[PDB]
């Protein structure tokens with residue numbers, strides 16, 4: 001198929017993320033290649049290389065078509081594509097489970113693979129719910145979170161999504177009613193933790209778990225908070241016998257300046273979700289990890305087993321490429337690499353503070369955010385970043401990036417400058 | 429890692445489908461290779477070749493390591509592993525969307541890609557809910573199904589699974605309260621459809637949709653029903669304005685002797701789910717298709733969009749291999765092939781009707797079932813099937829098979845023979 005034919009089939013037959021059929025404001029751009037930090041896209045009918053400032057929705061940490069990850073995939077392909085995980089095990093699942101157990105915060109000893117972040121969240125909740133049924137406390141079934149969060153699109157995951165971010169108004173009467181604390185602030189305020197605890201305390205007899213994105217809230221608005229809030233949640237959850245779940249689907253694998261964002265605070269959740277960057281952007285795969293205590297309680301309970309099992313659980317191809325992606329990350333000085341990226345993002349985005357439409361500029365590891373005072377019009381900003389050789393996708397009032405780790409100082413410069421310019425055109 | 433090392437790691441760190449940690453009665457077998465219809469498994473230190481009678485949980489329709497599917501994957505690997513589907517489109521997605529629209533029941537014109545069956549089911553339910561919100565009937569929010577069904581493990585998916593099979597209590601005050609018709613009989617009885625209509629009639633104003641597995645109920649108990657009920661379901665849904673959803677995640681791509689099980693009845697659902705065999709069992713991928721009318725109403729609704737967007741939506745690698753998998757199926761005389769497999773399963777399984785422990789023997793397309801009078805002990809069944817060079821995995825009281833389509837007559841006969849012998853051992 002040609003790019004013109006792709007557009008036509010696409011417009012008649014393809015849904016896209018949170019999109020329409022036949023009523024699309026803009027119109028998707030055809031991608032034809034991706035290599036390293038660059039995509040090849042079709043503009044005015046011509047191929048152009050542009051920087052993947054978004055890491056293809058936070059996935060491409062090592063860049064596209066990284067030779068070590070292509071080979072990991074090809075090697076596995078020639079030997080064993082997939083076998084069912086029911087009754088069978090295999091080397092890629094074992095290898096990856098060992099890495100994950102070793103590199104995640106202390107005490108996360110068991111791994112349940114699934115096919116996506118949303119599913120890993122539902123698995124996490126199911127772990128929490130079965131845990132308490134195992135302990136003889138079935139009333140502990142509600143979830144608690146703070147506002148501003150995002151956890152995925154499946155119905156249970158939607159229930160702990162920010163009520164505005166996740167559009168709860170469209171869903172009156174259909175979602176579980178969960179317990180929401182106020183928005184977690186940027187700077188550390190012990191009074192917020194105290195208020196969080198008081199709210200939790202009166203619900204504890206009915207809460208299975210607190211579920212949060214640690215340090216960085218992504219799709220709910222790219223807000224950062226002081227790691228010390230996570231230390232306080234760990235302490236609150238411990239004292240009131242409520243499980244603590246960290247969703248590190250966006251934050252995991254170095255993105256925020258630490259291996260896992262949990263690490264900034266030096267704290268272990270009881271249950272953890274990872275995804276997005278796990279396969280270095282090659283294939284869909286996710287994992288939920290839980291402590292030995294959670295694992296044994298579930299296993300010694302009435303049901304005798306965790307009641308879940310995706311068809312493609314522990315797929316050998318995804319697992320093989322993830323092992324390579326993780327080892328590649330661990331085999332380099334990733335901490336310096338992120339520090340440099342962060343400096344690059346700070347330096348390049350500094351001039352945007354002055355802009356008339358800009359309310360905030362903030363950076364956390366390989367994450368750079370320009371917050372505006374109004375919705376960023378994509379029909380303006382998209383062609384504007386393409387013109388400068390950058391793939392950028394603003395969302396709501398934010399002009400932001402999660403650049404691949406392999407980006408050079410010159411590439412970051414190029415990214416930040418495109419971002420600064422999108423912010424300027426918003427003010428005019 | 430060695431086989432022994434894998435077991436050691438697996439027993440300590442890996443969850444399996446519907447399994448425990450530390451309380452596993454049987455212990456998983458190590459798989460080291462898969463080619464065509466054969467797995468290489470490690471039995472007592474030694475490698476053996478066994479027929480994949482289960483098709484790796486109903487996925488490997490073309491066998492493993494098929495050269496056309498291998499190629500399609502490596503070809504796409506060197507070009508473009510993945511890009512975000514937000515704002516972008518690509519050839520693998522448009523080719524596959526085009527195919528899916530062309531070969532599925534008529535009127536199914538739009539395609540939403542996602543990573544797994546359970547997710548595609550939650551997407552289907554979301555389309556139904558938003559459709560009726562588009563029409564000003566937000567009261568239409570419940571789902572109706574008949575008993576014995578299975579739809580996945582995520583929380584909405586769970587709510588329409590059989591209330592005994594899915595252990596709905598266990599899940600007391602957590603699942604949405606859905607409407608359940610009695611188990612659909614094998615043989616056609618018009619009294620059943622009349623009772624279904626009468627039950628639907630009294631919930632019509634609160635029903636978004638009817639959701640069923642057409643013709644074959646999979647994980648709920650390998651039950652077959654007369655395609656004519658689907659015709660009745662279509663008629664009832666039309667007259668009462670309740671959307672019809674077919675979960676074809678197990679049944680699709682020729683498995684029941686028709687391309688899609690809906691074809692046995694000539695019926696078009698409003699919304700359809702596929703997965704499992706979609707990629708020929710290489711990678712995880714599912715799809716939810718809906719009619720133009722459904723797409724336009726959601727798009728014209730208050731929301732202006734379908735509020736869903738998985739990270740790895742429409743992953744190029746996964747789509748490219750699906751394209752090649754669908755093309756490979758459509759390019760051969762698949763109907764004759766499936767008729768041949770069915771005839772071979774029928775002939776090979778006949779002798780089991782006489783066995784003292786067998787209550788039924790049924791076949792439908794490339795699905796063969798020995799229904800036993802007691803639950804089947806895997807600790808006896810699994811080694812027995814291995815001894816005969818077959819990978820069989822019984823479920824509850826079923827010794828069943830869904831072999832790859834590339835299985836020769838002799839391989840089918842080896843499969844059925846191992847099934848008979850397992851059924852014989854159950855009777856003692």
Ligand SMILES: O=c1cc(-c2ccccc2F)[nH]c2cc3c(cc12)OCO3
Nearest residue numbers: 084085086309310311312445446485647
């Ligand atoms: O043995 C399995 C049983 C189930 C299952 C259990 C209870 C209810 C429904 C199910 F599909 N689900 C399964 C799902 C699997 C699998 C095995 C199983 O390997 C590939 O993915």
Ligand SMILES: O=c1cc(-c2ccccc2F)[nH]c2cc3c(cc12)OCO3
Nearest residue numbers: 017018057165219512513514737738739
């Ligand atoms: O643009 C996207 C927006 C959302 C989204 C929308 C509303 C609320 C939360 C979200 F993550 N989710 C998305 C998920 C995507 C994606 C794009 C988007 O490309 C690959 O996966």
Ligand SMILES: *Cc1c(COP(=O)(O)O)cnc(C)c1O
Nearest residue numbers: 116117118151152249250738739
């Ligand atoms: C993206 C995301 C999810 C959902 O991931 P999918 O693979 O899109 O289902 C869940 N949690 C967090 C924090 C995320 O950023």
Ligand SMILES: *Cc1c(COP(=O)(O)O)cnc(C)c1O
Nearest residue numbers: 310311544545546579580677678
């Ligand atoms: C296997 C199956 C599902 C769920 O598939 P996953 O990929 O395991 O989420 C849903 N519906 C039916 C009918 C199935 O057979």
